């Protein structure tokens, strides 16, 4: 019965993917950002220049105040509000209704995006990183405990203005091709995984694999870019520059600041290398890899001028909190968050990226010794 959940996600490029939900009685409709990098369910509950609508607790008879404030900081943006509980449902999701914790956002800073079309956020990670503490049961935990919905979900994010699917409670085999390859969830807080090798155009970056996971590596649908630790970011950029030395790009380009443009349909994709991330597998000394095409880490942006040329922004940035496999990485892949078996699966998506001579892929098996030494402690 997953067919009704296909295409239940919408959004704008670089503004996150959202699903429709309803809270309170009578049901109040709101678009909620899907974020695997956080664990709090929260919605705007007060007027805001960027909000077209918000949660009105006074209009819900099922609403319950928990009389307890909350603050939640994100890599970018933050908000604070009041904790409470209410009935919640997902129109284009499983046909059920559950009582879950809800944070009524009363104040925020650089959180709501102008024209994003969403007024809330659904943290799908674990309680361990929930605010104010792990006692605040996350939405998915509530859903699984109050219903018969299996303990797993999958995400198929499609690029370009953007759409996709969030299959709650299962895997929809028509949304991907080939085989699903699984990597262990190292620890249940963020969806933490271990990267055991990185190659650019088939060239090993030759770095201590611990560097790839310093101080952790996570899968985060709520982050746009591929974020890499300083040392890895530097090595990656250097390699990508040399590969594209043919042309010249402003130093601000590699910083995500300035953007580059080309005559409509003349983008020199071939000069940009593919990136291969090898992930720890399910059996001893075994891993698999996912290959990222330039069409993924070069996010298309509207021409700042009155021109009809294709402009893009470097979607790879430096991080100080570990590797982050954001939406640009998840796009083109079908990703299964198999919480029941503590693993994350990857397969080529049906709405995969397209290149003339190259193609994004998930390949295995590969032999990799000492993978456990790649984890940072
Ligand atoms: C100061 C951080 C303290 C630690 N906090 C966390 O780790 C929290 N989790 C997180 O912050 C997640 C790891 C990140 C989370 O998904 C948050 C969700 S914020 C709501 C998301 C809106 C969709 S636009 C996404 C945006 N795109 C973007 O910036 O594009 C350009 C770079 C081109 C401008 C982006 O990428 N945001 C990153 C940076 C980010 O912050 N994402 C919670 C666990 C409490």
UniProtKB/Swiss-Prot annotation:
Activity control, per UniProt: Inhibited by RTN3 and RTN4.
Domain (Peptidase A1) ranges: 17-347
Reactions catalysed: Broad endopeptidase specificity. Cleaves Glu-Val-Asn-Leu-|-Asp-Ala-Glu-Phe in the Swedish variant of Alzheimer's amyloid precursor protein
EC number of this enzyme: 3.4.23.46
Ranges in coiled-coil conformation: none
GO biological process assignments: amyloid fibril formation; amyloid precursor protein catabolic process; amyloid-beta formation; amyloid-beta metabolic process; cellular response to amyloid-beta; cellular response to copper ion; cellular response to manganese ion; detection of mechanical stimulus involved in sensory perception of pain
GO molecular function, one term: peptidase activity
Lineage: superkingdom: Eukaryota
Post-translational modification, as annotated: N-Glycosylated. Addition of a bisecting N-acetylglucosamine by MGAT3 blocks lysosomal targeting, further degradation and is required for maintaining stability under stress conditions.
Residues annotated as the enzyme's active site: 35, 220
Residues carrying a glycan: 95, 114, 285
Outcome of substituting residue 215 to N: Almost abolishes beta-cleaved soluble APP production
Annotated localization: Cell membrane; Golgi apparatus, trans-Golgi network; Endoplasmic reticulum; Endosome
Keywords, in A-Z order: Acetylation, Aspartyl protease, Cell membrane, Cell projection, Cytoplasmic vesicle, Disulfide bond, Endoplasmic reticulum, Endosome, Glycoprotein, Golgi apparatus, Hydrolase, Isopeptide bond, Lipoprotein, Lysosome, Membrane, Palmitate, Phosphoprotein, Protease, Signal, Transmembrane, Transmembrane helix, Ubl conjugation, Zymogen
Family (UniProt): Belongs to the peptidase A1 family.
Protein name per its UniProtKB record: Beta-secretase 1
Organism ancestry: Eukaryota, Metazoa, Chordata, Craniata, Vertebrata
Gene from which this protein is expressed: BACE1
